[PDB]
Each structure stands twice: as C-alpha cells, then as structure tokens.
Amino acid sequence: AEYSKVPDVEGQDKQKAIDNVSAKSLEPVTIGSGTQIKAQSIKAGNKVLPHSKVLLLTDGDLTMPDMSGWTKEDVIAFENLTNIKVNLKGSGFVSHQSISKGQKLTEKDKIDVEFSS
C-alpha cells in the first residue's frame, strides 16, 4: 500500500477511532469534547498520503483544535467538517489561530488563521 486507506471509524469510541486511524499510518486529530466519533473528514475507504491528517468530530460539544503547523487543506477540512467559516491569511503552515485551543465553538463563531513558511 503506497497510499493509506482511511478506515471507517464513525460511531467508534474516541480512543478506538484514534487507534484505528494511527494503525493505518495516518494522523488522527479529534475535534470536540465528546466520547464517540460522529464524523470523519476523509470518506472511509478513500486513499490518502501516509501520515496525513484525518479530522475526527466527536459527539457532544465542538471545541477548537490546536491547528499549529496545519496545511491549508487541513484547515479547509475543518471548515467543511464543522461548518465554521475560516479565513486563511498567507501561505505555508498555520502559525497563528484566532481562537485558543480547547475553547468551545458555537457555529456562530468565526476563525482567522495565519500561515507562514
């Protein structure tokens, strides 16, 4: 397998989903303070580059991840997964986010991220 095939982890408890994504040589990133996975950012069965991120939305409250070092593709994945609009400033890797990691998000929220080399 040159590409990693993304596993189906929707409906799994949070830690099981983390373990299952990591076992496919992918990087799981969880979003929210819940205990089960509600949605994943890449469709199960699709193939992606190894060690790329798979965003996992938990049930319960949506909370802000640490986007440090993310790519534009990672951030837009967050936008599409959560329906929270993000402004991307510049190019490169995320060097700043307007909402600190851990904060509960209300969908009335908006996010500004800055990229740098």
Add this chain to the structure above:
Amino acid sequence: EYSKVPDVEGQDKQKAIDNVSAKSLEPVTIGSGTQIKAQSIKAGNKVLPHSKVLLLTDGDLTMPDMSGWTKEDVIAFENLTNIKVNLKGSGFVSHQSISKGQKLTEKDKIDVEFSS
C-alpha cells in the same frame, strides 16, 4: 450517490475530459497541452457528484477560470500547480488576480477572493 474518480493521468486531454464527465464529475483542465500530466484527486476515490477534478496538462501552465470555485477547489489548484494562492474571504470565488487563459510560471502568485 458518490462517484469514483477515474485514472486519467497520461491520457489524451479530450479522452480524459470525457472520462471524468462520464463519472458525473466536472473536469477542469489547467494548461495548454494535449496530454494530462496530473489530476487533483486520487483515482478510485469516492467524491460527491459534479465535484471538480482538476487536470494538469503537459506544456505550458495556464490560468483557469475560477469563478464560482469553492475554497477546496482553489487549494487543490495550489497543490496541483505549486503556485501559491492567497485566499481572501469565504464562499465562492468572485475575483481572481490573473485573467483566465494567461500563461503561468511557479514564480507567479495569485490572489483570489470569495463571497456568498
């Protein structure tokens, strides 16, 4: 109702266009060549019907018409061409700093702005 992206890398440009359209997807070609060099989505992946598959041709890189594109489409263009795009706003593309058809080189930079 997902569609499976076909493998059109290396195909004749028109054949690739026809093959992507036959999967209910929107092919968008980038460049003025006659053979496909790269596609923006991995062949075999399931995507929403009528979503765009960007197709880089050989020959010269040239600017597509991005009007109405989503941010995801524009980021796909940046990754496919290695031309940095600055994305201003959210929604659908309403302006691009380089007119459609113009030859591009990787020392070009593109500003794109969005609206609802």
